[PDB]
């Protein structure tokens, strides 16, 4: 758990050749201990302190476990650990070289480089998930799948693979 | 932005063959429907098949089988046609079709029909020899004048009068194919009985395959 | 262009011993995308594992497809007396492809010596001025060995061209027919014909020595 | 299961074109890639390219390009290939393969493997016209002996002693595209010596093209 967060990216591709180095399995399974006993206590002292305090942090601990794996439900991620999209990477101008990140670069120094555009970054993303790819998919199921192909104006079915 | 290069002009013999081009200056071009489609004069736009530039996917029309030759090159942002064992009936102006675009962009979704085109080229498949134009003007209550250009082979003639000054009365025909596959043109230009004696009314007739800029005052 | 090049020579191995071969590339083949192709003269070339690793419904499990990225390897546990063919393997992978260089797997017995003929030409094709005459190596083990004619007291290469059959199943041998081509008036000249035929088993150039008027 | 019957086998002038067929049968002719392989009679084997039916995609040689045309005919569900410039090193067997797929059909995931196959023929270009050769006995405890097809057109010829009687202990050699414009051929077996009167051996040829099967004495 959090076992190589001060390596570089290059260091912490080892992290993300295992699983984020157990950063999701550290998220929802440190609750282990206050699921284990807010029930083993079997006494009354008429009046609770933590009834409120443990109650609010846990349904805080859900609720940010679940707006991840919305923002990955959006982006048609869900599941996967690591995925690629096809939004590009745009004007967006930290533009820089590929063998600085991924081989000398932290991922903390990498939040510090892109701290700004992040929630352009976030928009940007379901834009070319949804507004686009839904609806192409949407298109692809207003046609038979075996039946176009006769035409020889096959290029919308490449059109959809290319771009 | 689809802009289509074509190349020039051409005069060949039947069996020979002719590398017609269209260069793609800009848009999407290897992933598009390229057509090839010809016209000859008047009639209706002859499809002669076209070709997608991504995996050479020659779409062929079933009626010039074995006379076509369709490729393409991404390099050069080119398709070429290449018309292999040339017709006297093949003059036409050689248009060059690409499909369109949803939209709001150049980019998005095709539409099979075709938006752009090039600048068209022509070809003029005939045995008979380059020749000069010679120019004979009709001598002048009106009565109408010109001048018969003849003996010039292939198209086109471009006549001038005036230097392009008198625009009225330039009644601009197109050259009829006549006898002996030759060409004749005569734009008439009408002007009133009152100044036939003196006022210029020259037919200048220039001709790119002959390079002579034939001078001529009409004369009464 | 990714020239695939497998290389063992010939698999002279008894029946019952592992068919490993070297089955290599120029370069990396992409996604490792290769076919097992066995094939027998005359007849289809057939796949055997398909992606090299995966084997078709019908296909005989003693094939075995192993290896990656440039250089894929297969073995074969059992060797029956039907699959002793010759082997490749080919690429689905870029554009381009090319097929395995050939590996001939066989029957082994010892090594051995022949018994050697010549055949004199016949008169048959004689009287129409068309000589041929024929050398035999009669069941001789292995196939490789060299062949020197002495026609005239002379070495001959462009006119006597070999043939040569594969290991006939029965008696796990070879025989070599090498012709060399003359007409009749060159045959009342030549008295020598003895082919030097050299091998393992056929250490020194014998002869079966005939003239011209046998 | 998936057939592909070829065409047969070919002679034709050199310096000609050649065109060949695969006619399939079972599965689909379109959705999978049909597609054509060459071995020259001795190596290997070695692929050229491929068509696939239903797109007219074509993945053409990296050097008989230009100089090969495969099509795609399913109207009447066939597939042909034509070569150009017969030539003695055109001469190879020609196999038509179709990829094959998952399960025990023809309609499911394809491999990506020539699974299934035809049963191929020898393409090898003629020179000369047809010859009837002649057949010899090839005078030698062990006598050898062989009958010797030499100098015919065109291949092949097979050899059978005793009208194949004699079954055991036999030696065949193969044809050859040889030096003299025909094709000879070799057999032999292997007798004892004091038989030679007792049992006559009498090979038997045939020639197909030729049409020259007789019976021949061997007493030497
Ligand atoms: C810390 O960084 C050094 C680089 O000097 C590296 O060798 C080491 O493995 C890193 N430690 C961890 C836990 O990643
Ligand atoms: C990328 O960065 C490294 C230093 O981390 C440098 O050695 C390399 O030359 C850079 N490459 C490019 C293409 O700038
Ligand atoms: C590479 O990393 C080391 C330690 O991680 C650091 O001292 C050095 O400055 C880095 N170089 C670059 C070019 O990032
Ligand atoms: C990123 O955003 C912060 C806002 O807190 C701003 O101060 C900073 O200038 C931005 N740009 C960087 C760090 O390049």
């Known amino acids: 758990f959090l076992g190589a967060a001060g390596s570089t990216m290059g260091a912490a591709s080892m992290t993300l050749t295992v699983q984020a180095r157990n950063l999701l399995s550290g998220i929802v399974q440190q609750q282990s201990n206050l699921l284990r006993a807010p029930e083993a206590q079997q006494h009354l002292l008429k009046l609770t302190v933590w009834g409120i305090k443990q109650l609010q942090a846990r349904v805080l601990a859900v609720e940010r476990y679940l707006r991840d794996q919305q923002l990955l439900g959006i982006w048609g991620c869900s599941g996967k650990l690591i995925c690629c999209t096809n939004v590009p990477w745009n004007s967006s101008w930290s533009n820089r070289n590929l063998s600085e990140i991924w081989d000398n670069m932290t991922w903390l120094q990498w939040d510090k480089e892109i701290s700004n555009y992040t929630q352009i970054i976030y928009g940007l993303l379901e834009e070319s998930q949804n507004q686009q790819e839904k609806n192409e998919q949407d298109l692809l199921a207003l046609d038979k799948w075996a039946s176009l192909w006769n035409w020889f104006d096959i290029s919308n079915w490449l059109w959809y693979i290319k771009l | 932005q689809v802009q289509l290069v074509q190349s020039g002009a051409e005069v060949k013999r039947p069996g020979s063959s002719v590398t017609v081009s269209c260069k793609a200056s800009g848009g999407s071009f290897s992933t598009y429907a390229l057509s090839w489609v010809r016209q000859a004069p008047g009639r209706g736009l002859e499809w002669?098949?076209?070709?997608?530039?991504?995996?050479?996917?020659?779409?062929?029309?079933p009626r010039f089988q074995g006379r076509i030759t369709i490729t393409a090159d991404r390099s050069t942002s080119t398709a070429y046609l290449e018309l292999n064992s040339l017709r006297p009936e093949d003059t036409a102006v050689?248009?060059?079709?690409?499909?369109?675009?949803?939209?709001?962009?150049?980019?998005?979704?095709?539409?099979?029909?075709?938006?752009?085109?090039?600048?068209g080229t022509l070809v003029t498949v005939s045995s008979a020899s380059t020749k000069g134009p010679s120019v004979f003007p009709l001598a002048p209550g009106t009565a109408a004048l010109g001048c018969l250009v003849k003996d010039y082979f292939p198209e086109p003639v471009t006549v001038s009068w005036n230097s392009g000054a008198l625009t009225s009365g330039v009644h601009t025909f197109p050259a009829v194919l006549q006898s002996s596959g030759l060409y004749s043109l005569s734009s008439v230009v009408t002007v009133p009985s009152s100044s036939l004696g003196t006022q210029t009314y020259i037919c200048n007739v220039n001709h790119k395959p002959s390079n002579t800029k034939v001078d001529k005052k009409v004369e009464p | 262009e990714i020239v695939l090049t497998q290389s063992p020579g010939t698999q002279s191995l008894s029946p019952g011993e592992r068919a490993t071969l070297s089955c290599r590339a120029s370069q990396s083949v992409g996604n490792n995308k290769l076919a097992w192709y066995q094939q027998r003269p005359g007849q289809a070339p057939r796949l055997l594992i398909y992606?090299?690793?995966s084997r078709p419904s019908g296909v005989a499990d003693r094939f075995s497809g192993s290896g990656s990225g440039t250089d894929f390897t297969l073995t074969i546990s059992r060797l029956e007396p039907e699959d002793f063919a010759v082997y490749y393997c080919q690429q689905y992978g870029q554009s381009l492809s090319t097929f395995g260089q050939g590996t001939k797997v066989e029957v082994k017995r010892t090594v051995a010596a022949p018994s050697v003929f010549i055949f004199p030409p016949s008169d048959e094709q004689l009287k129409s001025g068309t000589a041929s005459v024929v050398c035999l190596l009669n069941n001789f083990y292995p196939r490789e060995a060299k062949v020197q004619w002495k026609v005239d007291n002379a070495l001959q290469s462009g006119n006597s061209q070999e043939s040569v059959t594969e290991q006939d199943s029965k008696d796990s041998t070879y025989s070599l027919s090498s012709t060399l081509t003359l007409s009749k008036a060159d045959y009342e000249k030549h008295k020598v014909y003895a082919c030097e035929v050299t091998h393992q088993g056929l250490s020194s150039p014998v002869t079966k020595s005939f003239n011209r008027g046998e | 299961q998936v057939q592909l019957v070829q065409s047969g086998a070919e002679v034709k002038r050199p310096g000609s074109s050649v065109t060949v067929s695969c006619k399939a049968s079972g599965g689909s002719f379109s959705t999978y890639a049909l597609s054509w392989v060459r071995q020259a009679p001795g190596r290997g084997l070695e692929w050229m390219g491929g068509?696939?039916?239903?797109?007219?995609?074509?993945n053409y040689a990296p050097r008989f390009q230009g100089r090969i045309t495969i099509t795609a005919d399913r109207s009447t569900s066939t597939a042909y290939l034509e070569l150009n410039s017969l030539r003695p090193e055109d001469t190879a067997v020609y196999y038509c393969?179709?990829?094959?797929?998952?399960?025990?059909?023809?309609?499911?995931?394809?491999?990506?493997?020539?699974?299934?196959w035809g049963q191929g023929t020898l393409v090898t270009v003629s020179s000369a016209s047809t010859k009837g050769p002649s057949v010899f006995p090839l005078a030698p405890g062990t006598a050898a002996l062989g009958c010797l097809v030499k100098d015919y057109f065109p291949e092949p010829v097979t050899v059978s002693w005793n009208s194949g009687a004699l079954t055991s202990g036999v030696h065949t050699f193969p044809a050859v595209l040889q030096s003299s414009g025909l094709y000879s051929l070799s057999s032999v077996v292997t007798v004892p010596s004091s038989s030679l009167g007792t049992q006559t051996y009498i090979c038997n040829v045939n020639h197909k093209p030729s049409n020259t099967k007789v019976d021949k004495k061997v007493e030497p």
């Open positions: 393969a179709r990829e094959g797929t998952t399960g025990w059909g023809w309609l499911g995931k394809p491999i990506g493997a020539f699974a299934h």
């Open positions: 992606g090299a690793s």
């Open positions: 068509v696939i039916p239903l797109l007219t995609i074509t």
